[PDB]
Amino acid sequence: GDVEKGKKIFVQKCAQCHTVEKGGKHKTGPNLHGLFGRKTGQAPGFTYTDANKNKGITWKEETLMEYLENPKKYIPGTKMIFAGIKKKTEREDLIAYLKKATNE
Ligand code: HEC
């Protein structure tokens, strides 16, 4: 996906609750550094819902594509407020950005 378009989506839809830099602060939502290849609910120092904590999936392209379309459907009970991104290409672009930034 397109990293620059993804970064724009992140800034407008995600940065108000999340950081992505290594050891970046928690905000309303957990810091997302190291997300890829890790189970749900594993950001050190963040207090997750049991729902998020116990979803038992690994974050990766496939699971984020589904989740970001409709978070509350994928993790019923989540405390994350976000309707969803309808467009597959927008999801891909965002995920490409996240794959870059959360791995810096
Ligand atoms: C913009 C589209 C995003 C994206 C890419 C993510 N979020 Fe959030 N988020 C918020 C909170 C409170 C949580 C914890 C939910 C809970 O404990 O029930 C989350 C969680 C996530 C995750 C899962 C992290 C994990 O380690 O399992 C992911 C991948 C994620 N978010 C991505 C809070 C917010 C917001 C507050 C109003 C909004 C806006 C966003 N998140 C937006 C996004």
UniProtKB/Swiss-Prot annotation:
Q: Which residues form a coiled coil?
A: none
Its localization reads:
Mitochondrion intermembrane space
Q: Which GO terms describe its biological process?
A: apoptotic signaling pathway; cytochrome c-heme linkage; mitochondrial electron transport, cytochrome c to oxygen; mitochondrial electron transport, ubiquinol to cytochrome c
Q: How is it modified after translation?
A: Binds 1 heme c group covalently per subunit. Phosphorylation at Tyr-48 and Tyr-97 both reduce by half the turnover in the reaction with cytochrome c oxidase, down-regulating mitochondrial respiration.
Molecular function, one GO term: lipid binding
Modified residue annotations for Phosphotyrosine: Y48, Y97
Indicate where the modification N6-succinyllysine is found in the sequence.
K55, K72
Residue positions, PTM N-acetylglycine: G1
Q: Give binding positions for heme c.
A: C14, C17, H18, M80
InterPro entries, alphabetized: Cyt_c-like_dom (IPR009056), Cyt_c-like_dom_sf (IPR036909), Cyt_c_1A/1B (IPR002327)
Q: Which residues carry this modification: N6-acetyllysine?
A: K72, K99
A cellular component annotation (GO) from this entry: cytosol
A Pfam family hit: Cytochrom_C
Keyword field contains Heme:
yes
Task: Just give the chief location class.
Answer: mitochondrion
* Described purpose of this protein according to its UniProt entry: Electron carrier protein. The oxidized form of the cytochrome c heme group can accept an electron from the heme group of the cytochrome c1 subunit of cytochrome reductase. Cytochrome c then transfers this electron to the cytochrome oxidase complex, the final protein carrier in the mitochondrial electron-transport chain.
What family does this chain come from, according to its entry? Answer: Belongs to the cytochrome c family.
Q: What else is known?
A: Mules and hinnies are heterozygous, having equal amount of horse and donkey cytochromes c.
Question: Would you tell me the protein name for this molecule?
Answer: Cytochrome c
Origin species, per record, is: Equus caballus
Show the taxonomic lineage.
Eukaryota, Metazoa, Chordata, Craniata, Vertebrata
